[PDB]
Design a protein around this ligand. Structure first.
Ligand SMILES: *[C@@H]1O[C@H](CO)[C@@H](O[C@@H]2O[C@H](CO)[C@@H](O)[C@H](O)[C@H]2NC(C)=O)[C@H](O)[C@H]1NC(C)=O
Ligand SMILES: *[C@@H]1O[C@H](CO)[C@@H](O[C@@H]2O[C@H](CO)[C@@H](O)[C@H](O)[C@H]2NC(C)=O)[C@H](O)[C@H]1NC(C)=O
Ligand SMILES: *[C@@H]1O[C@H](CO)[C@@H](O[C@@H]2O[C@H](CO)[C@@H](O)[C@H](O)[C@H]2NC(C)=O)[C@H](O)[C@H]1NC(C)=O
Ligand SMILES: *[C@@H]1O[C@H](CO)[C@@H](O[C@@H]2O[C@H](CO)[C@@H](O)[C@H](O)[C@H]2NC(C)=O)[C@H](O)[C@H]1NC(C)=O
Ligand SMILES: *[C@@H]1O[C@H](CO)[C@@H](O)[C@H](O)[C@H]1NC(C)=O
Ligand SMILES: *[C@@H]1O[C@H](CO)[C@@H](O)[C@H](O)[C@H]1NC(C)=O
Ligand SMILES: *[C@@H]1O[C@H](CO)[C@@H](O)[C@H](O)[C@H]1NC(C)=O
Ligand SMILES: *[C@@H]1O[C@H](CO)[C@@H](O)[C@H](O)[C@H]1NC(C)=O
Lengths: 217, 65, 146, 48, 98, 49
């Protein structure tokens, strides 16, 4: 006959880091195996289609790295942008929204870059989307997510003021929306200070980005 | 020509390499034949063009409190 | 043989990065573009919303999550017996501070007076194990009285 | 992908791998076992 | 012969301590121990929250609690009989060992 | 080449067992620590626990 019920709550901005694409690499297998010498290459021809299989396989990997990077970021139909007036109900996205003074990445999206780190027929190919185009997609995904809730995924990006969006987010977890409005300034300060701990964490230690740095290493 | 500078080879120096026989244009369109570092090429008013790809139409969401 | 070895490891490594993509593409489409109901998919706690941020060769999600934080104990019962009717809470749960009975929402203490609005009837008080006797206030009664 | 992987496995039967001929019935038509075993072992090493 | 087998970090008597903690959380506190706090709740009230989670309104549990408890106890008893009367159920695990 | 063949097949087999470990970590989060509205994810029938 005993139940425990929370008389208060905390809002936590837990970071998660996922690798999405390798460095696109292709090795010109004839110049790697048998470089700058026809006297060798006429011997490599006796192995037949082998060097075509290895160029084919590395090209398959290399186009999948563009496919992965498109499948992750290019989910937004069109590039949403935030208004001039940042009237988001007391919440403070200035550390996660792009900074126009900068490479137009956000503040946290720059710490994430600063925390992370060959001519023998080896080639490294560029990604299809420049790292600045990835920063436009993450800006558009984020500008939809702030100004228009989930409905920019389902259809047209219908605007909704942010203190009504977080009330739909609260109603979605079975907390009655008046719990947000009666606590909105506290919820804003908990979110803003939790975002502040993300800068302090990512600035203080590289050990968070172990998943990406392992894929580079 | 991947990774080269055109001096070693209607010519355009992309970040992927020297691109020969594609007309560079200042417009942007959806991607068609993907090249690299934001460049895509297509057959358009006809001839082969190359351009910085558009990610989509820009849309200022009409937000207010 | 050393190139066949490298491209074989590289096919296997590309397959596991294509498996952290798809996972990242569904965290994008469910945690960012929606609000996932899926426990611990979008960070520990109940999920509110996520923001994607770019990272070199990856993606980073800032999963905003509600975590309940200062619990109090209460006495509780599955239903309240009234005039032989058993009343069950709609969305809430019954609790008592030891002297008074309330219905509250389940994830934040919000005690409300028990009424025929926040509770529904079924059967009678004999069937339910651990039912407790209490008042139910009828919202109509003072209005019909005046 | 399956058709091109399999046609490449089949085209690799036309490859010498350093043997005197691509066709194993021609090696066994030309050579006695003390030498044919060296030629066949290049084809085994390559085809395998 | 150059081949070696290394121990797991979590010993079998320590995996069985986590499975105990996971179901001892689940049995006393519902899902809430996933969302940070292990809030206790009596079990016939946790099952009323789980009946709401399938659109069966909760008085269906209480009006049938002896039946639902007997159906669960009987059904879990048949798992002991299944796992005693045949080894063929663990096909996936015996296959990864094979 | 017998070791490279064994190690290659253990690498592939480890990706198969990790796809199952990620599925088990997912079922543990979404069905032990929760309740799933995902049809047929946690047994036939509507999932309880
Ligand atoms: C719930 O916890 C928060 C802190 O997370 C409390 O907010 C503090 O309240 C005290 C007393 O009013 C203030 O002095 C502090 O400045 C507030 N901020 C913080 C971060 O402590 C809040 O009062 C608690 N109660 C409820 C119901 O929200
Ligand atoms: C959002 O948060 C930022 C800090 O991350 C605030 O920017 C600071 O504003 C004060 C004046 O209020 C300045 O003295 C600081 O130099 C600013 N710091 C930076 C890093 O720019 C910003 O004011 C907040 N905005 C809102 C609307 O809350
Ligand atoms: C249980 O909750 C009720 C309602 O808040 C409490 O009753 C009130 O108690 C205060 C003093 O604490 C009085 O000023 C009110 O007049 C009381 N109202 C009623 C309707 O009785 C009750 O004290 C609480 N009991 C415990 C043990 O916490
Ligand atoms: C809940 O309240 C009812 C009504 O007062 C109680 O029912 C009475 O129980 C006694 C024996 O305990 C009988 O002698 C009476 O005839 C019953 N009255 C009626 C109207 O049925 C019931 O026992 C109470 N239960 C609890 C657990 O408090
Ligand atoms: C290409 O090489 C020429 C050599 O004169 C140089 O002027 C030019 O800056 C180079 N451009 C690039 C993009 O490398
Ligand atoms: C592109 O822009 C430059 C000025 O920056 C201009 O000289 C040139 O004519 C333009 N070319 C096309 C194809 O529009
Ligand atoms: C609830 O009460 C029990 C004693 O009955 C105590 O052990 C426990 O710590 C209490 N929990 C809270 C959240 O106060
Ligand atoms: C709780 O346990 C005690 C054990 O004596 C029992 O008297 C009581 O009826 C039980 N209550 C419920 C709701 O099962």
């Amino acid at each position: 006959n005993s139940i425990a019920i929370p008389t208060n709550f905390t809002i936590s901005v837990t970071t998660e880091i996922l690798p999405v694409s390798m460095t696109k690499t292709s090795v010109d297998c004839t110049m790697y195996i048998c470089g700058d010498s026809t006297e060798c290459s006429n011997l490599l021809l006796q192995y037949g289609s082998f060097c075509t299989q290895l160029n084919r396989a590395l090209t398959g990997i290399a186009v999948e790295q563009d496919k992965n990077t498109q499948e992750v970021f290019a989910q937004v139909k069109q590039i949403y942008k935030t208004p001039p007036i940042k009237d988001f109900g007391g919440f403070n996205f200035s550390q996660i929204l792009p900074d126009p003074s900068k490479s137009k990445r956000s503040f946290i999206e720059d710490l994430l870059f600063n925390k992370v780190t060959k001519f023998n027929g080896l080639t490294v190919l560029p990604p299809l989307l420049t790292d600045e185009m990835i920063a436009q997609y993450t800006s558009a995904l984020l500008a939809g997510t702030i100004t228009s809730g989930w409905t920019f995924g389902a259809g047209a990006a219908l605007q909704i003021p942010f203190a009504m969006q977080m009330a739909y987010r609260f109603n979605g977890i079975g907390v009655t929306q008046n719990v947000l409005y009666e606590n909105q300034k506290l919820i804003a300060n908990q979110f803003n200070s939790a975002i502040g701990k993300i800068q302090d964490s990512l600035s203080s230690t590289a050990s968070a980005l172990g998943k990406l740095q392992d894929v580079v290493n | 020509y991947q990774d080269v500078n055109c001096t070693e080879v209607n010519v355009f120096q992309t970040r992927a390499g020297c691109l020969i026989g594609a007309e560079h244009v200042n417009n942007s369109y959806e991607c068609d034949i993907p090249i690299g570092a934001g460049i895509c090429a297509s057959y358009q008013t006809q001839s082969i063009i190359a351009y910085t790809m558009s990610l989509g139409a820009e849309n200022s969401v009409a937000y207010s409190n | 043989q050393s190139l066949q070895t490298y491209v074989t490891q590289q096919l296997i490594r590309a397959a596991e990065i294509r498996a952290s993509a798809n996972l990242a593409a569904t965290k994008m489409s469910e945690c960012v573009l929606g609000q996932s109901k899926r426990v611990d998919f979008c960070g520990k706690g109940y999920h509110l919303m996520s923001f994607p941020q770019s990272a070199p060769h990856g993606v980073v999600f800032l999963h905003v999550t509600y975590v309940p934080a200062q619990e109090k104990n209460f006495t509780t019962a599955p239903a309240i017996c009234h005039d032989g009717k058993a009343h069950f809470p709609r969305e809430g749960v019954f609790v008592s501070n030891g002297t008074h009975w309330f219905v509250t929402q389940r994830n934040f203490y919000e005690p409300q007076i028990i009424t025929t609005d926040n509770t529904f009837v079924s059967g009678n008080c004999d069937v339910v194990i651990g039912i407790v006797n209490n008042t139910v206030y009828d919202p109509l009664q003072p209005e019909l009285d005046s | 992908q399956n058709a091109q992987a399999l046609n490449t496995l089949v085209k690799q039967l036309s490859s010498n791998f350093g043997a005197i001929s691509s066709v194993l019935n021609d090696i066994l038509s030309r050579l006695d076992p003390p030498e044919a075993e060296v030629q066949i072992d290049r084809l085994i090493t390559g085809r395998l």
